[PDB]
Scaffold this active site. Structure first.
Site, PDB file in Angstrom:
ATOM      1  N   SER A  60      36.151  33.628  38.211  1.00 29.24           N
ATOM      2  CA  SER A  60      37.422  32.934  38.385  1.00 29.24           C
ATOM      3  C   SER A  60      37.944  33.051  39.804  1.00 29.24           C
ATOM      4  O   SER A  60      38.937  32.399  40.144  1.00 29.24           O
ATOM      5  CB  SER A  60      38.479  33.480  37.425  1.00 29.24           C
TER       6      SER A  60
ATOM      7  N   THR B 169      41.106  34.668  39.547  1.00 29.97           N
ATOM      8  CA  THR B 169      42.182  35.020  40.468  1.00 29.97           C
ATOM      9  C   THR B 169      42.099  36.468  40.928  1.00 29.97           C
ATOM     10  O   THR B 169      41.849  37.381  40.141  1.00 29.97           O
ATOM     11  CB  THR B 169      43.557  34.810  39.842  1.00 29.97           C
ATOM     12  N   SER B 170      42.335  36.652  42.223  1.00 30.17           N
ATOM     13  CA  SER B 170      42.292  37.955  42.869  1.00 30.17           C
ATOM     14  C   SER B 170      43.383  37.992  43.921  1.00 30.17           C
ATOM     15  O   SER B 170      43.430  37.113  44.787  1.00 30.17           O
ATOM     16  CB  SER B 170      40.939  38.183  43.537  1.00 30.17           C
TER      17      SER B 170
ATOM     18  N   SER C 169      42.474  39.082  37.841  1.00 27.33           N
ATOM     19  CA  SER C 169      41.417  39.396  36.897  1.00 27.33           C
ATOM     20  C   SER C 169      40.071  39.561  37.579  1.00 27.33           C
ATOM     21  O   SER C 169      39.082  39.858  36.901  1.00 27.33           O
ATOM     22  CB  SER C 169      41.314  38.315  35.817  1.00 27.33           C
ATOM     23  N   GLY C 170      40.008  39.391  38.899  1.00 27.34           N
ATOM     24  CA  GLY C 170      38.854  39.777  39.677  1.00 27.34           C
ATOM     25  C   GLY C 170      39.046  41.131  40.311  1.00 27.34           C
ATOM     26  O   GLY C 170      38.263  41.509  41.194  1.00 27.34           O
TER      27      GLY C 170
END
Ligand SMILES: Nc1ncnc2c1ncn2[C@@H]1O[C@H](COP(=O)(O)OP(=O)(O)OP(=O)(O)O)[C@@H](O)[C@H]1O
Ligand SMILES: [Mg+2]
EC number: 3.4.25.1
Lengths: 242, 149, 109, 72, 261, 242, 71, 249, 196
Positions: free
Chosen positions: I168, I1-2, I129-130
């Protein structure tokens, strides 16, 4: 007993005088409203009157925005008007929350009706003294009007009026849908339905109007808006040039 | 009303556009139509008393139009519009329509022009049943004579 | 036997036909007797329009025969309104006939 | 003057004939009224009005100075 | 107590309405022929007190000049019985030889009473006199040029057979003078008095409400006492502005509450 | 016997209870709220009942949060309860949304609370008129709140015994300035019209309090007038009425 | 029957309103409408006149049709 | 504070509870409704009325659905009818459709509703609902069943009955009209004929609300390929159907 | 996820990807995370899917009532709602929300709310988390007040590096443009931004 009518209990006639008295307190502002169905819109007009100049005219209102597609027009005292408005906004939020789509007007009519019933079944509730008109444009039912009253009864309409002199308006609407032979005006622009409505109001009440004497609310698709005085003036001018 | 600002503004305008009337009046010699517009906007009033005053400026003006032998047609349409515009205080307009008929008698026009203008004028007040009636009958009998011959 | 089973507005018709029988037996003492009973059976408000048109018709003829042309004209005016404006299956002939009696009533006055 | 089942309708007929001659059909302009009464919450709404007792004077409970005078 | 067509200002709409019942069939019965109605008659006047309901009564007797009687509610009441019937029976008779008569009952609450007679004998005395009226009002005795103007200060005192239409066909209420209806009343009463020159009433009066039409003439009287205090001969707007405070003050002494049909 | 409770109605549309509360308010002292272009100016007449009092040591104007002044007339302890309640609600909004409460939002809250006291036999409707207002970011606003739970916008509002005089004078002040005046200039005017509203009350002597919330001079916070400014306003009125 | 009407006027719009009247008040409304007619200055009763006269001295009920929720 | 916990319903000195007497008077104030139990179905019929003729009556209902086998119809107060229909559905689901996963027999449901009425007669802060309800339904063990629940909280089973202000006359008519074998068709014609004696106003299928607890409809099921479940035995007849039966009298 | 949001002249542009993994398995590769809770005040969720969605529902609820009673709420106000929801459920719920919204008066604004719950106003916000991989890329090349074209290519390139380095993150890139003009969606497929 001597008390039948300080609490909500039947009379020897089998009746509720109290609720009657509620209906006898809906005509104290003496505001009148007229609401008609277009073909893709719903239009409602109400009077605005200020008894004094030292009021600010903007804040004086009777067309209350409940949902983004449901407008609410109130006949009766303004305190109870505000309590009703708050009630309804709460229920709308909660419907959106629990079911994942905005509240339908029908559902709101009934929810408010049942709350009304509860105010006339508990011995220490006072009923609202307001008649509410719910105007909407639905996508499953089309333009609709639902009227609820202090009893907790509600009914649908093709058009309807409210106020002390609303019989005059009833005559007008009756004759209009008599000629047309159909349950709604066939007009494809909301403006001209505002115009028609104001025409029937001038005919019915017997008195001409001005921008500061009117208040107009329009329910179009997927929205509700109110016109300001400037836009109301334009409607009045286009009436004379019909 | 809720403000008194329209009151101060409307009354005051009335006095000042008397001062500007001679300017308008010379401008009508160059083009009446533009001067006509200026007085037409003037008559847009939201205050009652100023209506009576502003209609007098137009009365002097339209004498020139009435006397003309093409422009009185255009004048008949205007009278129509005035009653419709807003109503604009049921006293003002009812005085004007009279003063114009009174002018027509004194300007001295063709039988034909007199006849056709009046039919246009009695038509307007058929949709009214206020002070108009007094005048309506009087110009009706004036028209009777016309067809009597 | 249907008077113990008096629930039906279709006993109006029976009174009316009895009135007609005495009418062409040319006695109106008994014609009125059976008319009154017809008005009684038609006091119920659940009877059709057509049968009430018949009710006024019979009275129209009857007070005409009794030579009162004020009552006859009012009754015939009522029946003209019924026959003329509802559907026609024999009401074309019965609007015609009522009309001719309206004209006759005025000649006597 | 909303009476229910009593002889108060006999009483009020000398109230009503008072209000009639306290109206002008002239020859009462020079004729006045003074009235004393213990209580002024028991009067009829046709005596609130001006033309009957126009001026309405209250008698106050005494003052400091006033009390001294009275004793003397 | 005579005054012109105008006995009030700003309530002229009700003055016009009254003459519809009274004055119009007086002049021409023939315009009520065209319609085919019964010639109007019968009037109830009711409202808050001091509002010119009686002064209007004097004005319609003065202005038209039609034959007038009158009756105070309590000068037709007699000790002898069959004698208080006698007058009012014989008063209607008078009304049929005298042209277009107008019968003003002034301030009737005396025989306004209901059936009572569980109280004293006075309540049957009322009853005897009341029955007398009904037979006159409607019967083989019918009026047409005899009119009733009935003046009362509260109409829910009455017996409902004296609220009966076609004896009372129009029920005209005159309310309390309005926001600018006081203004209209003030301009006629500032002509009577001596004044500096006062056309500055307007704001003060609207926001000193609580006045009936007779109290407007008490603002002028009380302003002539403030004047007397100053040793002035004119009504000043200094005198007037202290007067409206005072006159309003003395009326808050007791309230009045009345409701109507 | 329809005067006994608030949850009763009457066939006249009346609910005698609530009307009677107005007579409690008619017993209070003059209190004015002047709506100016820049903000609001409140003033209260503070009767000096005895020569044993400590002057300028009792406030009848209390602030809620910091930008809404509240001044009330009628029953002083009862209005005091109302103001306490409104501060609770204000702090709630402030915690929940991270912004000082808007004045219309405040209006909703107090109106609902007072409207509540007519629906239950259990409680008595408050006998106070409140005037509250101030500057928020959508401008200055003014509201007057009825003991009935009614309110409207106002360009000038008043209550008390000398309300007669005050209303008339305010009419004039809007006729002097139909485009309004400065909150700076309004200090002197509040002084003026309180003084004029004490001739109906000229049994006594009084102390003048003035406070204001304007954007141009206090930076949108509700502060009190003092010192040379306050005394100058006093002198202004004094010379006018002599 | 006695008085003139206009073809605009109807007697069938009077059933729907109140359902307890006395014979004197029906003689009353029609007479009251014959005074309003002269304020227009008209000799034929219009339906404007006829409804206004009903509205005065109406003696309203909450037992009659178009005023009910006991249905 | 609140202290309405004492009953507003008491015994009268002459023996009765006054409040149900007043409520039962209120029932003879309302609309007229009737129900006939045939051998092979049940038919329920009522009149549609509104304040104004310009009000809609298609967006309004007097025959309501509690379950796909059980309908109700009322005479008395509208507002009281509305809330109580919802409550009936409510307790029908929470105490038979969570405990046995299926819909209740007609009778079971009747008792479920009679308790709500009962606790509107007991427990201060309430007054009785001023309605009489016909609960018509079909269950698989006692067949077709027609009940009447009164303002009191009792019920009675009937073979045919009527409620409302025209009840005395209607019941006398149904006295002859009822037969030991009746066809649902014949009962439809009969119900219309009776309620025609009861109704003064315009008579169409748009003002007469007809519903039948007749036989199952696989087309109203909303799915196919399940023979085990069958369709609703209730059906509301829209105006078209009813307009034929006006003519078949 | 970003997720990220970047302010520009005329408003703000919100940017997200659509890859949503549980474990190693991508549940849906076309998932939306740009959510509307008002009609001008959009959010970007990340953290636990369940947690973010629940919280978003409740905040929509409160804002809608706000609109019906008091007029539309401001970006500030919505951010405060999110904060006060995180602060009561910080021990049980794990949410990182970026609240980006257009105020007619001030312009687009960006607040970020960590999972403990606090508001931070920023000219540009990132989370997920990216996002721990593109911090420097953002910070060097960012200026205040760029043009719309610039903003779009900016967020495109930033999210390309995020997609590259975080597994992710992936799928199409989605953007929401909040301006006075209205609300515009943009969507960029992988073939489009890999070339660059
Ligand atoms: N509107 C008015 N303007 C001037 N004077 C008035 C007005 N109305 C009343 N008055 C004065 O008040 C006096 C008495 O009032 P009047 O007797 O006419 O009134 P009323 O309404 O019937 O009440 P009541 O019968 O109780 O006196 C009059 O003689 C006159 O001086
Ligand atoms: Mg008098």
């Amino acid at each position: 007993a001597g008390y039948d009518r300080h609490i909500t209990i039947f009379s020897p006639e089998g009746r509720l005088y109290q609720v009657e008295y509620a209906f006898k307190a809906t005509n104290q502002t003496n505001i009148n409203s007229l609401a008609v169905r277009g073909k893709d819109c719903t239009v409602v007009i109400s009077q605005k009157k200020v008894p004094d100049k030292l009021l600010d005219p903007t804040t004086v209102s009777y067309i209350f925005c409940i949902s983004r597609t449901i407008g609410m027009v109130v006949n009766g005292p303004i305190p109870d008007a505000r309590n009703a408005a708050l009630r309804a906004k709460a229920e709308a939020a909660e419907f959106r929350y629990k079911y994942g789509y905005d509240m339908p007007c029908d559902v709101l009519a009934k929810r408010m009706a049942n709350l009304s019933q509860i105010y006339t079944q508990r011995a220490y509730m006072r009923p609202l003294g307001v008649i509410l008109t719910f105007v909407s444009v639905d996508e499953e039912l089309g333009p609709s009007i639902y009227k609820t009253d202090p009893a907790g009864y509600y009914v649908g309409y093709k058009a309807t009026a409210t106020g002390p002199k609303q019989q005059e308006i009833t005559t007008n609407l009756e004759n209009h849908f008599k000629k047309s032979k159909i349950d709604h005006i066939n007009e494809e622009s909301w403006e001209k339905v505002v115009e028609f409505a104001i025409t029937h109001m001038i005919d019915a009440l017997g008195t001409e109007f001005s921008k500061n004497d009117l208040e107009v609310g329009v329910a179009t698709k997927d929205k509700f808006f109110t016109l300001s005085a400037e836009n109301i003036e334009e409607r009045l001018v286009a009436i004379a040039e019909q | 009303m809720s403000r008194d600002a329209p009151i101060k503004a409307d009354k005051d305008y009335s006095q000042i556009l008397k001062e500007e009337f001679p300017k308008i009046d010379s401008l009508a010699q160059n083009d009446c139509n533009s001067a006509l517009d200026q007085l037409l906007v003037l008559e847009k009033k939201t205050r009652q008393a100023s209506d009576l005053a502003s209609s007098k400026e137009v009365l002097a003006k339209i004498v020139d139009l009435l006397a003309s032998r093409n422009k009185w047609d255009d004048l008949n349409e205007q009278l129509t519009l005035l009653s419709k515009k807003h109503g604009q205080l049921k006293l003002s307009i009812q005085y004007m329509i009279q003063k114009v008929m009174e002018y027509l008698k004194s300007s001295k026009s063709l039988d034909l022009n007199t006849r056709i203008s009046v039919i246009e004028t009695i038509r307007v007040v058929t949709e009214n049943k206020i002070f108009v009636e007094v005048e309506r009958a009087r110009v009706t009998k004036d028209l009777v004579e016309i067809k009597k011959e | 036997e249907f008077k113990k089973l008096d629930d039906k507005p279709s006993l109006v018709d029976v009174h009316l036909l009895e009135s007609k029988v005495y009418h062409k037996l040319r006695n109106l003492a008994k014609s009125k007797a059976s008319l009154t009973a017809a008005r009684t059976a038609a006091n119920s408000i659940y009877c059709p329009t057509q049968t009430v048109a018949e009710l006024d018709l019979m009275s129209g003829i009857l007070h005409c025969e009794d030579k009162d042309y004020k009552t006859a004209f009012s009754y015939f005016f009522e029946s003209f309104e019924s026959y003329h404006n509802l559907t026609t299956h024999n009401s074309y002939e019965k609007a015609c006939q009522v009309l001719k009696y309206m004209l006759l009533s005025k000649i006597m006055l | 003057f909303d009476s229910e089942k009593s002889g108060d309708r006999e009483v009020q007929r000398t109230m009503l004939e008072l209000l009639n001659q306290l109206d002008g059909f002239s020859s009462d302009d020079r004729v006045k009224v003074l009235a004393a009464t213990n209580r002024v919450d028991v009067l009829d709404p046709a005596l609130l009005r001006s033309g009957r007792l126009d001026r309405k004077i209250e008698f106050p409970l005494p003052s400091e100075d006033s009390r001294a005078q009275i004793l003397q | 107590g005579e005054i012109t067509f105008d006995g009030i200002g700003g309530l002229t709409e009700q003055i016009r309405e009254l003459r519809e019942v009274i004055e119009l069939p007086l002049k021409n019965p023939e315009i009520f022929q065209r319609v085919g109605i019964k010639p109007p008659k019968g009037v109830l006047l009711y409202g808050p007190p001091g509002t010119g309901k009686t002064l209007l009564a004097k004005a319609v007797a003065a202005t038209i000049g039609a034959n007038f009687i009158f009756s105070p509610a309590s000068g037709i009441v007699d000790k002898y019985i069959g004698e208080s019937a006698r007058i009012i029976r014989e008063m209607f008779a008078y009304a049929k030889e005298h042209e277009p008569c107008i019968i003003f009952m002034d301030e009737v609450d005396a025989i306004g009473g209901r059936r009572f007679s569980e109280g004293t004998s006075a309540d049957r005395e009322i009853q005897r006199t009341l029955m007398e009226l009904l037979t006159q009002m409607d019967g083989f005795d019918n009026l047409g040029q005899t009119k009733i103007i009935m003046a009362t200060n509260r109409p829910d005192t009455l017996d409902p057979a004296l609220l009966r239409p076609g004896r009372l066909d129009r029920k005209v209420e005159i309310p309390l003078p309005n926001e600018a209806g006081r203004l209209e009343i003030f301009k006629i009463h500032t002509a009577k008095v001596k004044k500096t020159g006062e056309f500055d009433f307007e704001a003060a009066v609207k926001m000193s409400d609580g006045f009936n039409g007779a109290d407007i003439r008490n603002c002028a009287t009380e302003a002539g006492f403030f004047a007397i205090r100053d040793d002035r001969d004119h009504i000043n707007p200094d005198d007037l502005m202290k007067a409206v405070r005072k006159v309003a003050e003395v009326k808050k002494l007791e309230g009045t509450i009345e409701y109507q049909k | 016997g329809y005067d006994l409770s608030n949850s009763v109605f009457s066939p006249d549309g009346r609910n005698f209870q609530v009307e009677y509360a107005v007579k409690a308010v008619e017993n209070g002292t003059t209190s004015i709220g002047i709506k100016c272009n820049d903000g609001v100016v409140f003033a209260v007449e503070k009767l000096i009942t005895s020569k044993l009092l400590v002057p300028q040591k009792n406030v009848k104007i209390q602030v809620v949060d910091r930008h809404i002044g509240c001044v009330y007339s009628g029953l002083i302890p009862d209005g005091r309860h109302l103001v306490n309640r409104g501060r609770e609600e204000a702090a709630s909004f402030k915690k929940l949304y991270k912004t000082p409460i808007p004045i219309p939002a405040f209006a909703d809250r107090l109106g609902q609370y007072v409207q509540a006291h007519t629906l239950y036999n259990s409680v008595r409707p408050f006998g106070v008129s409140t005037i509250f207002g101030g500057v928020d970011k959508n401008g200055a606003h003014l509201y007057m709140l009825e003991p009935s739970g009614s309110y409207w916008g106002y360009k000038g509002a008043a209550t008390g015994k000398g309300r007669q005089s005050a209303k008339a004078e305010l009419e004039k002040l809007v006729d002097h300035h139909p485009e309004g005046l400065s909150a700076r200039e309004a200090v002197k005017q509040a002084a003026k019209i309180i003084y004029l509203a004490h001739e109906d009350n000229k049994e006594k002597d009084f102390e003048l309090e003035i406070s204001w919330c304007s954007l141009s001079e206090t930076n949108g916070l509700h502060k009190f007038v003092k010192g040379d400014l306050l005394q100058e306003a006093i002198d202004f009125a004094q010379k006018e009425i002599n | 029957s006695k008085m003139s009407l206009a073809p605009e006027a109807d007697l069938d719009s009077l059933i729907i309103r109140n359902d307890s009247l006395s014979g004197a008040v029906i003689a009353a409304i029609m007479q009251e409408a014959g005074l309003r007619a002269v304020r227009k200055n008209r000799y034929v009763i219009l339906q404007s006149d006829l409804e206004e006269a009903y509205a005065t001295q109406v003696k309203t009920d909450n037992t009659v049709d178009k005023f009910d929720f006991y249905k | 504070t609140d202290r309405y916990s004492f009953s507003l319903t008491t015994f009268s000195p002459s023996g009765k509870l006054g409040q149900i007497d007043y409520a039962l008077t209120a029932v003879k104030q309302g609309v007229t409704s009737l129900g006939i139990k045939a051998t092979n179905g049940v038919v329920i019929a009522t009149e549609k009325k509104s304040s104004s003729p310009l009000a809609m009556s298609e967006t309004l209902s007097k025959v309501s659905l509690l379950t796909p086998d059980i309908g109700a119809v009322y005479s008395g107060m509208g507002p009281d009818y509305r809330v109580l229909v919802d409550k009936s559905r409510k307790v029908a689901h929470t105490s038979y459709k969570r405990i046995y996963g299926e819909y209740p027999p007609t009778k079971l449901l009747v008792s479920e509703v009679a308790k709500i009425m009962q606790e509107a007669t007991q427990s201060g802060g309430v007054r009785p609902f001023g309605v009489s309800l016909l609960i018509a339904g079909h269950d698989e063990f006692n067949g077709f069943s027609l009940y009447q629940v009164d303002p009191s909280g009792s019920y009675f089973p009937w073979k045919a009955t009527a409620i409302g202000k025209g009840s005395v006359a209607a019941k006398t008519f149904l006295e002859k009209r009822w037969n030991d074998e009746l066809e649902l068709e014949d009962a439809i014609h009969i119900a219309l004929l009776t309620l025609k004696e009861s109704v003064e106003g315009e008579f169409n299928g748009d003002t007469i609300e007809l519903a039948i607890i007749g036989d199952e409809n696989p087309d109203l099921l909303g799915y196919t390929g399940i023979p085990t479940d069958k369709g609703p035995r209730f059906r509301k007849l829209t105006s078209q159907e009813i307009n034929d039966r006006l003519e078949a009298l | 996820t970003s997720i990220m949001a970047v302010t520009f002249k005329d408003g703000v542009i919100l940017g997200a990807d659509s890859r949503t993994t549980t474990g190693a398995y991508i549940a849906n590769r076309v998932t939306d995370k740009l959510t509307r809770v008002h009609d001008k005040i959009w959010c970007c969720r990340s953290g636990s899917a369940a947690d973010t969605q629940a919280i978003a529902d409740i905040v929509q609820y409160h804002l809608e009532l706000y609109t019906s009673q008091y007029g539309t709420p401001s970006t500030e106000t919505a951010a405060s709602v999110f904060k006060e929801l995180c602060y009561e459920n910080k021990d049980n719920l794990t949410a990182g929300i970026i609240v980006a919204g257009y105020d007619d008066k001030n312009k687009g604004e960006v607040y970020t709310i960590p999972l403990g719950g606090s508001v931070h106003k920023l000219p540009y916000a990132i989370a997920g988390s990216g996002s721990t991989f593109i911090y420097g890329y953002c910070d060097k090349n960012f200026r205040e007040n760029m043009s719309k074209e610039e903003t779009v290519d900016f967020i495109k390139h930033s999210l390309s590096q995020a997609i590259k380095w975080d597994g992710s993150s992936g799928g199409v890139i989605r953007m929401v443009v909040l301006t006075a003009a209205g609300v515009e969606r943009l969507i960029f497929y992988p073939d489009e931004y890999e070339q660059l």
